[PDB]
Design a protein around this ligand. Structure first.
Ligand SMILES: [Cl-]
Ligand SMILES: [Mg+2]
Ligand SMILES: [Mg+2]
Length: 260
């Protein structure tokens, strides 16, 4: 993936800062195989995050939903000196590509406000991947790294995905719209007001009502919300089908094109 030039990526700030200032070590451009990547906005961090698979997306959405989560720093880099030492102490070949030892990274490093632990890490991997010896070795390197720092670490796989969350993702990500036009975002403020007053009403009813009110073709507003939701500008109760969500279950943001 990366040559000795990694030194420059380190200078770019990759892996430093937090909130809107945090820069992932890996970005969507570093996505392998058919594995689809995602750039979703976060209300908590105020920035767009890079997820490298649908599984990671599912985890991110769960994190963004949690009230106790304060920050989500995805693709977090593990200090090379620490990982080389661990590789040595364990007798495991530190990740190498063409002789250059690679910089390892945990999928998510998250901070909390009142959970059991103020900070914890997560590695996302499909259950099947654990049947490969090399993956296990790499996972041990990662496990030890966090253990060394007394930060709880966990592995999240597909069988940890709530079925409802799963179907919600299947509805939101059959790629409908990705065009984040200033005009699409313009709909955030108006939509926020409507949803706020029609709070206790089912999201689908309110959607039809708006279509009628403004004389839009049936489904227009649902399509808009579906797009703003899939992009992270709108958050909802992922543990409940979107269609069963009340308007009060949705949360809209103040995001403007100043996302550079
Ligand atoms: Cl994955
Ligand atoms: Mg990773
Ligand atoms: Mg992974």
């Amino acid at each position: 993936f990366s040559e000795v030039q990694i030194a420059r990526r380190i200078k770019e700030g990759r892996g430093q800062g937090h909130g809107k200032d945090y820069i992932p070590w890996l970005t969507v451009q570093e996505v392998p195989s058919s594995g689809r990547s995602h750039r979703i906005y976060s209300h908590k961090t105020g920035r767009v995050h890079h997820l490298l698979s649908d599984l990671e997306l599912a985890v991110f959405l769960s994190l963004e939903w949690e009230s106790s989560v304060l920050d989500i720093r995805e693709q977090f880099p593990l200090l090379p000196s620490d990982t080389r030492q661990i590789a040595i102490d364990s007798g495991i070949k530190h990740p190498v590509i063409r002789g250059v030892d690679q910089v390892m990274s945990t999928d998510f490093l998250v901070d909390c406000k009142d959970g059991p632990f103020e900070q914890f890490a997560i590695q996302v991997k499909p259950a099947a991947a654990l049947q490969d010896e090399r993956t296990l070795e790499k996972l041990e390197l990662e496990r030890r790294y966090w253990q060394q720092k007394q930060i709880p670490w966990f592995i999240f796989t597909d069988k940890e995905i709530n079925p409802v969350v799963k179907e919600n993702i299947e509805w939101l990500y059959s790629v409908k719209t990705e065009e984040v036009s200033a005009e699409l975002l313009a709909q955030l403020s108006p939509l926020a007001h409507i949803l706020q007053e029609k709070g206790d009403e089912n999201i689908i009813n309110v959607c039809k009502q708006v279509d009628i009110a403004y004389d839009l073709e049936l489904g227009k507003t649902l399509s808009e919300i579906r797009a703003l939701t899939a992009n992270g500008f709108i958050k909802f109760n992922i543990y409940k089908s979107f269609r069963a969500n009340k308007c009060a279950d949705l949360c809209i943001s103040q995001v403007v094109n100043m996302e550079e």
